[PDB]
Ligand binder design. Structure first.
Ligand SMILES: [Mn+2]
Ligand SMILES: [Mn+2]
Ligand SMILES: [Mn+2]
Length: 431
DNA sequence: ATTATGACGCT
DNA sequence: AGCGTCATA
């Protein structure tokens, strides 16, 4: 037992913005605040597609992926903000810029890994050691954790309100703590949670945006923790909380297991919950899911994961894409060339801003298309050199690499019609 | 006809 | 390199 690594060496947090694109629009338009509200892209087809939903609107059953016309059936007073359109397409610049606001604040506390437009991991291990340094063995007051939930508590041997339950759990947690031990993982997580309160307070003070967070010993548990008490709260998932938590946790809830692999774990092993994985040897799991996945599952079901928080605050690709669904599919050369130019002009604008802001240049242009009839997201993916930030050159180059995908006899018709265009700049070098 | 992204793994 | 998988607003 004394040699079995417990995966408690790190303190890792995940901070995720609440209903992020909705909050961006609510900051801008005070009339949308504290309302059932959603963000929609486009409009003509079924009212547009919903991509973010306020918690008030969720109460009516409104979700992402829903057509606005259908959401209005559940929630007639639903308010809608539209994604900007530029050069004929949805343009997400407002939300990318709001993201940078939050990421730059988080970066003041620790090096971050940008994991999406609205969330980042933080390795707080070093910051926790120094805060423990300056605490002088002083206990942690509940006042320092005003929005923190301790997963699994309260428990054991009155009160039916939810804030009261949070405090009860927190009280039990702090009561059990050993603040005398600067190496105690539970104490380290608790100090991590104090820092994340500070981080989240700073984000809200300086941007107007609320967020949730999870604190644990690794990225997967931090991510899971974060969702447990959204919105506007943070959750601490201790190592000790994992057996109960995982005993009823569907496998698909764990990050990376929400797709085909997770379904195969369930199918092959005849299990449902994360905790049930503990009954298989590492070699058994490797036999079914491969060396890497098998080792990962073996540790993960015990609450252990080693994936580091990467020091990367900026995306490593900048891309532009557009679907051409139904009968809007591009069937002529002039059409294909027009849209490549629109994408290329947005790409140039974003690339040029990126070079000025971030002292780097992209060196490879990736061009991707989908053809009508193909089930795959992408039908074809080709790269070429990106030597100049020039939209006409990039669009001309993109057309050159896709030129013979056209099985048309004639020059000017495009067959089979294109249902997606994608331009992506990659392979950055310092500049 | 959810769309527009973005990262990582396989071979 | 090109494809697949998984993820997130
Ligand atoms: Mn979010
Ligand atoms: Mn998110
Ligand atoms: Mn989401």
């Amino acid at each position: 037992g004394p040699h079995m690594a417990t995966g408690q060496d790190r303190v890792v947090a995940l901070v995720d913005m609440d209903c992020f694109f909705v909050q961006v629009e609510q900051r801008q338009n005070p009339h949308l605040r504290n309302k059932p509200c959603a963000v929609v892209q486009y409009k003509s087809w079924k009212g547009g597609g919903i991509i973010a939903v306020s918690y008030e609107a969720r109460a009516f059953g409104v979700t992402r992926s829903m057509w606005a016309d259908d959401a209005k059936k559940l929630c007639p007073d639903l308010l809608l903000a539209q994604v900007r359109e530029s050069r004929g397409k949805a343009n997400l610049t407002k939300y990318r810029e709001a993201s940078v606001e939050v990421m730059e604040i988080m970066s003041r506390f620790a090096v971050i890994e940008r994991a999406s437009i609205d969330e980042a991991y933080v390795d707080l291990t070093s910051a926790v050691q120094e805060r423990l340094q300056k605490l002088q063995g002083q206990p942690i007051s509940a006042d320092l954790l005003p929005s923190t939930y301790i997963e699994g508590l309260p428990q054991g041997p009155e009160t039916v309100q939810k804030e009261g339950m949070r405090k009860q759990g927190l009280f039990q947690w702090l009561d059990s703590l050993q603040i005398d031990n600067l190496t105690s993982p539970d104490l380290q997580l608790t100090v991590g949670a104090v820092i994340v309160e500070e981080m989240r307070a700073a984000i809200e003070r300086e941007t107007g945006f609320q967020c949730s967070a999870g604190i644990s010993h690794n990225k997967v548990l931090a991510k899971l923790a974060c969702g447990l008490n959204k919105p506007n709260r943070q959750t601490l998932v201790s190592h000790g909380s994992v057996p109960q938590l995982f005993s009823q946790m569907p496998i698909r809830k764990i990050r990376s297991l929400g797709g085909k692999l997770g379904a195969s774990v369930i199918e092959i092993l005849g299990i449902e919950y994360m905790g049930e994985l503990t009954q298989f040897t590492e070699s058994q799991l490797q036999s079914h899911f491969g060396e890497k996945n098998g080792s990962w599952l073996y540790a993960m079901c015990r609450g252990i994961e080693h994936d580091p928080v990467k020091p990367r605050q900026l995306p490593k690709t900048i891309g532009c894409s557009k679907n051409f669904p139904g009968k809007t599919a591009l069937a002529t050369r002039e059409q294909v060339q027009w849209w490549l130019l629109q994408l290329a002009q947005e790409l140039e604008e974003r690339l040029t801003k990126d070079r000025n802001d971030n002292d780097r240049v992209a060196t490879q242009l990736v061009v991707s298309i989908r053809v009508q009839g193909d089930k795959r997201l992408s039908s074809l993916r080709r790269c070429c050199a990106l030597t100049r930030y020039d939209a006409h050159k990039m669009s001309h180059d993109a057309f050159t690499v896709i030129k013979n995908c056209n099985t048309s006899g004639i020059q000017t018709e495009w067959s089979p019609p294109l249902t997606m265009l994608f331009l992506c700049a990659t392979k950055f070098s310092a500049s």
